[PDB]
């Protein structure tokens, strides 16, 4: 059953049950009045008059919010906080090594953002240029992102764990003019070779657009240097003026691109504009985490993911919050690390991932030994379904049974929270994301697109726009419409399945398309398959996900070798290492299943449902449409070994 709203939260909450009901209704009945007023969470240089201007219609997918208005993201996240709060900490940085930490005030962060903005301008970067950021979890990554946004450059942040090949791919598609990186990242007492990875990427003959690499000397390690191209971060920023006046950007000027894995093909650049995105990030942050001035807030997500964009940086700083950036991992040196960070910086709001929760839960009270945790008032969960038992352990052990847990469902494409509890408004069910946010109209449809009413399950769609919605796929608006708006006409299709219960609470069950969730990472089965087939011994591959107690899903790859090739344990590790090279360690198959028995239909289609079942440990329960039905038996045998 339900968790009641505690008394401490009821007494302070920004949105109560009744305000949620009232605001939700208006957001839906009158978007223009609702978002017109809510848009004032931001400072606008010239005020908007238009609010909502959107369509999901076939051939006319067009999303626009606050369009005739102008603003600066960096002014909203920095400059406007200066007069009264310049001395308030903007970012608490906690090093992988706990002996290393910083408190960076709004004034401090502003100064460096201005210097770096000038640094970028002097290097020839202009409004609209794409800048590639390949950084570890250090404050300079934020400086780099905020400075791009200040001058209307379009940053494209590349998760540090991506391979040189994956970096090349993102740089090529985006025509990035500059790469910003560090010599090495530090994670769990170990180096990560970032700049070296950038060198390798830039040797790709198809990379033609990068003019400079800016390098942060994080570790001081010996690295290669290309004279002319490579520039030290300190060398540049020390030469730069701390004076920079922000220019008005139009609400619909592109702000960033984020490569995101899909059901088809290689990752695409999901694009966000400026006004609606930032309004939505600030609004969701404030109401869902119940942010009050003085609250120390910690989102654990990496900067290279949308959660790190919206909920580490943009949402929090637009609201004048203290946000915490942690360089390392929540269980190094010990499982208690996460709660040690909480104690050390008196974190009041913690927002993390079920993969982490499961990792700490496996260690039991080792995750909490010698720690206090009393500063916490709110907990959050993101990025993957959370099982009830994990949710209960998190609520009990980290939250001391005193903290609401906000399970926030959303996606790169949605820009901010979509279905989520509000801590003082909505009673909680372990495992449920609960109710839509203001502006969000979800529905469940069957495979044919008939809407399902009452307590039911189906494909999760959103039937109208909301300020934070992604506007396009970089350089390919037609693929944007086809990818999201063609399956169920006039609706945004998320690619998730969900059930809705008798209370109207949504329970998100995961992707219904060919998209995996591995340790919280969204990866397409097809991109793993291509990476596998690029191997000169591999003929065919079929990749499925299997349940995994820790990772949520593990990657299971059926692999057909070229005629004349035999498997080995040598080849096992080789092929795993090959995928880690093609994409990154995050996409390394957990299982390689050597076979010549892929179930192909008369047409040649791969019978993917059978492969899924077999990989999952099913041994029983159509084979008639199938060239050689005997493959199923062979597949089972091989699985049993
Ligand atoms: C939210 C930041 C991560 O965004 P990405 O675009 O990388 O992945 C979005 C997908 O993560 C899952 N997902 C995300 N949050 C939840 C969630 N809270 N519950 C269940 N599944 C979730 C859903 O399948 C979704 O389609």
UniProtKB/Swiss-Prot annotation:
Mg(2+) binds at residues 533, 535, 538. The record marks 513 as: Hinge residue important for conformational flexibility. Catalyzes the conversion of acetate into acetyl-CoA (AcCoA), an essential intermediate at the junction of anabolic and catabolic pathways. Acs undergoes a two-step reaction. In the first half reaction, Acs combines acetate with ATP to form acetyl-adenylate (AcAMP) intermediate. In the second half reaction, it can then transfer the acetyl group from AcAMP to the sulfhydryl group of CoA, forming the product AcCoA. Required for acetate recapture but not for acetate excretion when this organism is grown on ethanolamine. It comes from Salmonella typhimurium (strain LT2 / SGSC1412 / ATCC 700720). Keywords: Acetylation, ATP-binding, Ligase, Magnesium, Metal-binding, Nucleotide-binding. Monomer. This is Acetyl-coenzyme A synthetase. Changing residue 353 to V: Results in a 2-fold reduction in the catalytic efficiency for both ATP and CoA. 3-fold increase in the affinity for ATP and 3-fold reduction for CoA. It catalyses: acetate + ATP + CoA = acetyl-CoA + AMP + diphosphate. Changing residue 605 to A: No acetyl-coenzyme A synthetase activity. One of its GO terms (molecular function) is ATP binding. ATP binds at residues 383-385, 407-412, 496, 511, 522. It is an enzyme of class 6 (ligase). GO terms for cellular component: cytosol. Coiled coil: none annotated. PANTHER family: ACETYL-COENZYME A SYNTHETASE. Belongs to the ATP-dependent AMP-binding enzyme family. Its EC number is 6.2.1.1. The keyword Cell inner membrane does not apply. Changing residue 520 to S: Results in a 2-fold reduction in the catalytic efficiency for both ATP and CoA. Almost the same affinity as the wild-type for ATP, but 9-fold reduction in the affinity for CoA. Its cofactor is Mg(2+). Changing residue 513 to P: Results in a 2-fold reduction in the catalytic efficiency for both ATP and CoA. 3-fold reduction in the affinity for ATP and 4.5-fold reduction for CoA.
């Amino acid at each position: 059953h339900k968790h009641a709203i505690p008394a401490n939260i009821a007494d302070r909450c920004l949105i109560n049950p009744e305000q949620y009901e009232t605001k939700y209704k208006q957001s839906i009945n009158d978007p223009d009045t609702f978002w017109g007023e809510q848009g004032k969470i931001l400072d606008w240089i010239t005020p908007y008059q238009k609010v909502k201007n959107t369509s999901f219609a076939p051939g006319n997918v067009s999303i626009k919010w606050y369009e005739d208005g102008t603003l600066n993201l960096a002014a909203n996240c920095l400059d406007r906080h200066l007069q009264e709060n310049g001395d308030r900490t903007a970012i608490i940085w906690e090093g992988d090594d706990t002996s290393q930490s910083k408190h960076i005030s709004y004034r401090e962060l502003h100064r460096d953002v201005c210097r770096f903005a000038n640094t970028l301008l002097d290097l020839g970067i202009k409004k609209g240029d794409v800048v590639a950021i390949y950084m570890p979890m250090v404050p300079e990554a934020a400086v780099a992102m905020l400075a791009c946004a200040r001058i209307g450059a379009v940053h494209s942040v590349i998760f540090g764990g991506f391979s040189p090949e994956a970096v090349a791919g993102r740089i090529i598609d985006s025509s990035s003019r500059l790469v910003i990186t560090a010599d090495e990242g530090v994670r769990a007492g170990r180096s990560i070779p970032l700049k070296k990875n950038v060198d390798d990427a830039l040797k790709n003959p198809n990379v033609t657009s990068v003019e400079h690499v800016i390098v942060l000397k994080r570790t001081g390690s010996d690295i290669d240097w290309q004279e002319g191209r490579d520039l030290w971060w300190r060398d540049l920023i020390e030469k730069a003026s701390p004076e920079h006046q922000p220019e008005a950007m139009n609400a619909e000027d592109p702000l960033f691109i984020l490569y995101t894995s899909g059901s088809t093909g290689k990752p695409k650049g999901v694009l966000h504009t400026t006004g609606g995105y930032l309004v939505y990030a600030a609004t969701t942050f404030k109401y869902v985490f119940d942010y009050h001035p003085g609250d120390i807030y910690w989102c654990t997500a990496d900067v290279g993911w949308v959660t790190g964009h919206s909920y580490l940086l943009y949402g929090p700083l637009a609201c004048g919050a203290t946000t915490l950036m942690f360089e390392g991992v929540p269980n190094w040196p010990t499982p208690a690390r996460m709660c040690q960070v909480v104690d050390k910086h008196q974190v009041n709001i913690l927002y993390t991932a079920p993969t982490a929760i499961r990792a700490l839960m496996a260690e039991g009270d080792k995750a909490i030994e010698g720690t206090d945790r009393s500063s916490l008032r709110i907990l959050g969960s993101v990025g993957e379904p959370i099982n009830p038992e994990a949710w209960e352990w998190y609520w009990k052990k980290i939250g001391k049974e005193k903290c609401p847990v906000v399970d926030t469902w959303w996606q790169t494409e949605t820009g901010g929270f979509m279905i989520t509890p509000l801590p003082g408004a909505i009673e909680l069910k372990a495992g449920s994301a609960t109710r839509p946010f203001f502006g969000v109209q979800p529905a469940l449809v069957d495979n044919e697109g008939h809407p399902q009413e009452g307590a039911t399950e189906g494909n999760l769609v959103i039937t109208d726009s909301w300020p934070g919605q992604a506007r396009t796929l970089f350089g390919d608006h037609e693929r944007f419409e086809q990818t999201y708006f063609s399956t169920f006409k006039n609706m945004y299709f998320s690619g998730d399945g969900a059930r809705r219960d008798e209370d109207g609470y949504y329970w998100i069950t995961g992707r219904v398309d060919d998209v995996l969730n591995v340790s919280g990472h969204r990866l397409g089965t097809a991109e793993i398959e291509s990476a596998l087939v690029a191997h000169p011994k591999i003929a065919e591959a079929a990749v499925v996900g299997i349940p995994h107690a820790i990772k949520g899903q593990a990657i299971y790859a059926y692999v057909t070798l070229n005629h004349g090739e035999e498997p080995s344990p040598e080849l096992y590790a080789e092929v795993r290492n090959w995928v880690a090279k093609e994409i990154g360690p995050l996409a390394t198959p957990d299982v390689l299943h050597w076979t010549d028995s892929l179930p192909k239909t008369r047409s040649g289609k791969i019978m993917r449902r059978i492969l899924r079942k077999i990989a999952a440990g099913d041994t029983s329960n159509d084979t008639s449409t199938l060239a050689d039905p005997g493959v199923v038996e062979k597949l089972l045998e091989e699985k049993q070994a």
